């Protein structure tokens, strides 16, 4: 999938068709946080920073996971703010 083709929410949403129903995080929450489905298991990537996340757990918040593992993402920073990211990185 072309990263440029995934710049808008609606485009990201349509990538989730065969997304496993057993995974306790929903496409809407993933797509909102910049993620699209790469078509394997529960693997997703961010359209902006190309960071990959998998093995979603109950209670996971995709924005928090985005900040935990890919804190330099500019989409993340513009949406949630550097302060949010700093705190998730343990900078208070
Ligand atoms: C519990 N919440 C989940 C979202 C989580 O934290 N997942 C971790 C993760 O996705 N990570 C871990 C971090 C550590 C440093 C960078 N990693 C990014 C990410 C990951 O494992 N990404 C893989 C490897 C790189 C290629 C790729 C491509 C698509 C999707 C995932 C990944 C990890 C996945 C394997 C089981 C343990 C938890
Ligand atoms: Zn990102």
UniProtKB/Swiss-Prot annotation:
Q: In which tissues is it expressed?
A: Present in many fetal and adult tissues. Mainly expressed in adult skeletal muscle, thymus, testis, ovary, and pancreas, low or absent in brain and peripheral blood leukocytes.
Q: Can you tell me which family this protein belongs to?
A: Belongs to the IAP family.
Identify the coding gene.
BIRC2
The cellular location(s) given in this protein's UniProt record come to: Cytoplasm; Nucleus
The species this protein was found in: Homo sapiens (Human)
Where the BIR repeats fall, as residue ranges, is 9-76
According to the UniProt entry, the note on domains is:
The BIR domains mediate nuclear localization. The CARD domain is necessary to stabilize the protein and inhibit the activation of E3 ubiquitin-protein ligase activity of BIRC2/c-IAP1 by preventing RING domain dimerization and E2 ubiquitin donor binding and activation.
Q: What is this protein called?
A: Baculoviral IAP repeat-containing protein 2
Subunit structure as annotated in this protein's UniProt entry: Interacts with DIABLO/SMAC and with PRSS25; these interactions inhibit apoptotic suppressor activity. Interacts with CASP9. Interacts (via BIR domains) with TRAF2; the interaction is required for IKBKE ubiquitination. Interacts with E2F1, RIPK1, RIPK2, RIPK3, RIPK4, BIRC5/survivin and USP19. HSP90AB1. Interacts with UBXN1. Interacts with GSK3B. Interacts with several death receptors, inclusing FAS, TNFRSF10A and TNFRSF10B. Recruited to TNFRSF10B in the absence of receptor stimulation. When TNFRSF10B is stimulated, further recruited to the receptor and cleaved by caspases.
């Amino acid at each position: 999938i072309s990263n440029l083709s995934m710049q808008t929410h609606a485009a990201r949403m349509r990538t989730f068709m065969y997304w496993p129903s057993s995974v306790p995080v929903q496409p809407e929450q993933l797509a909102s946080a910049g993620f699209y489905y790469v078509g394997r298991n529960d693997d997703v990537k961010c359209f902006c920073c190309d960071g990959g996340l998998r093995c979603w757990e109950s209670g996971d918040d995709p924005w928090v996971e985005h900040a935990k593992w890919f804190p330099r993402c500019e989409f993340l920073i513009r949406m949630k703010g550097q302060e949010f990211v700093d705190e998730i990185q343990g900078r208070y």
